[PDB]
Design a protein around this ligand. Structure first.
Ligand code: NA
Lengths: 321, 327
């Protein structure tokens, strides 16, 4: 009955985002609709600022802070998209931001975050080293940590996508969503379920690593990870506390897609729809082509989220070659 | 403005309405989202019409389909013919498959294999012949006189123009308060169709054309008052590599098109880089033309604090070429 985020938080976020972050395209897809024997629409969060949706939740958090909180500075850790989302937000709001990264994060991602204003700190040869440094920085400098998903405002920001979907297409039947730590689907599901709960919200993760999926099937929080994935944005072994709480209550299903199916989805998106997607941005479309949603999607209206496009063209060519 | 176009120009709002009906449930409305990068850069609201995501990878399906569909069954049973190195070939070829029509497409012996493959995959017979358009166009008329196939012009035809104009109707539906529409010009079919649709509905909307500095037949004609050839050399916007505009298109353009601006190869390249890197959409050179004009500063007096639609006309370019043109 009681959840840690409500429609009001997403309506508050809408208002903080009003005139700053903007609605992305959601066109009917020719290729996917023919393939899937139903109407497939593609939500372009890859074309949101910074190249992923992460700006939304990050902008809501950072601007819902008090001046007393903004003076404290802020801090995060990421090798890609979250780093970029907080940085643009830190420039936009003029908040002093620092961002920790491992000592081998893509050079394209390492400059993109500096250009966006925030100070990059390269440190350690793994992800847990990054978190070790953040804890030290918060401890010593007194900066506000910006969670990539497990935060009510972050989730609220993300939810603004759900409003956009129903605003553009409110005879939508299905919404298909990628999951890492769980903020995108959490936000989206609250927005959708609060306004039209008969719209089915379906999650997607890689077979290689799916903490949230494992938690969703288990009934409590648990880890799952064997190896990495092409959907690197969703390489998250253990799902968030707030996010799992919401997903278990509101998400109608979570499906798993293989690496080959992620690749096939990337190929179709760039080749047959002309949109640049990274692996995590192709997860939802992977699930459509897999055949695992056919009974949900056939002769119905289905929205597939393109969560990000931060991938080097050479890597696209490698995968879609 | 509706009645003046009807009475005085060779294509009218009625033709566009006929086309919308023929395309109904076969060709669908492409997206038209606001662009973050271009709005920031232009200090105004920029919307991107994604004909690169239309069937075949460009808008040319609209005109080809409207034309082929408009034929009597007697005409359809004669079969059709066309020549193209890419986008028109694909449009004619798919339209032939959708309508059950017997098509024959002549392509130069040296077109990008991907385009040749795509035209084949559909339905039409691909006749590879000659190293240029003059060679391929020469082979077409032989086919016309020998086999009696109906020729499908790429732009200078009232059904083809009407077909393209359905784009104008979709812009009005999605964005009734649009101020500007920026449109690439090869032969002028796309902009002719859009100009008729837009101006017949709300004539206070500006329709502005774009061509490469390297080849701009329509621009030269426009500014000369006479059909005129222009070509210095080839362009990245190869889809608009047309040295002499159509007769019907020039007539329509010189009445309804507010201006035509020219953009350099650097500007075209910059626009492609922006569309792919900053907006995550694949565009071929011609599909980048309108966006090139916006970023060049050459439309600064029209777009600040306004609503402006940029036509992304096509996305038919090999990912390998996108890589070497871009970063
Ligand atoms: Na003029």
């Amino acid at each position: 009955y009681d959840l840690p985020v409500a429609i009001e938080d997403i309506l508050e976020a809408k208002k903080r985002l009003a005139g700053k972050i903007y609605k992305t395209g959601m066109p009917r897809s020719n290729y996917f609709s023919e393939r899937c024997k139903g109407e497939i629409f593609l939500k372009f969060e890859n074309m949101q600022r910074t190249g992923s949706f992460k700006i939304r939740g990050a902008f809501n958090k950072l601007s819902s802070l008090t001046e007393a909180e903004k003076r404290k500075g802020v801090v995060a850790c990421s090798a890609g998209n979250h780093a970029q989302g907080v940085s643009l937000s830190c420039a936009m709001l003029g908040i002093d931001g620092k961002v920790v990264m491992p000592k081998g994060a893509p050079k394209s991602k390492v400059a993109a975050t500096c250009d966006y204003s925030a100070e990059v700190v390269l440190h350690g040869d793994n992800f847990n080293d990054t978190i070790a440094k953040v804890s030290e920085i918060v401890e010593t400098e007194g900066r506000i940590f910006i969670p990539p998903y497990d935060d009510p405002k972050v989730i609220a920001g993300q939810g603004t996508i759900g409003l956009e979907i129903m605003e553009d297409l409110y005879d939508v039947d299905n919404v298909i969503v990628p999951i890492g730590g769980g903020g995108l689907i959490a936000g989206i599901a609250i927005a959708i379920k609060s306004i039209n709960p008969t719209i089915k919200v379906i999650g997607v993760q890689a077979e290689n690593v799916h903490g949230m999926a494992a938690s969703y099937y288990t009934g409590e929080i648990t880890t799952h990870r064997t190896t990495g994935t092409l959907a690197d944005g969703c390489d998250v072994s253990r799902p968030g506390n707030l996010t799992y709480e919401i997903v278990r209550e509101l998400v109608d299903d979570i499906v798993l897609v293989s690496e080959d199916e992620i690749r096939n989805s990337m190929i179709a998106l760039i080749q047959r729809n002309k949109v640049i997607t990274e692996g995590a941005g192709a997860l939802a479309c992977a699930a459509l082509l897999s055949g695992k949603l056919d009974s949900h999607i056939q002769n119905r209206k289905t929205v597939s989220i393109i969560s990000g496009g931060n991938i080097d063209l050479s890597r696209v060519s490698q995968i879609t070659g």
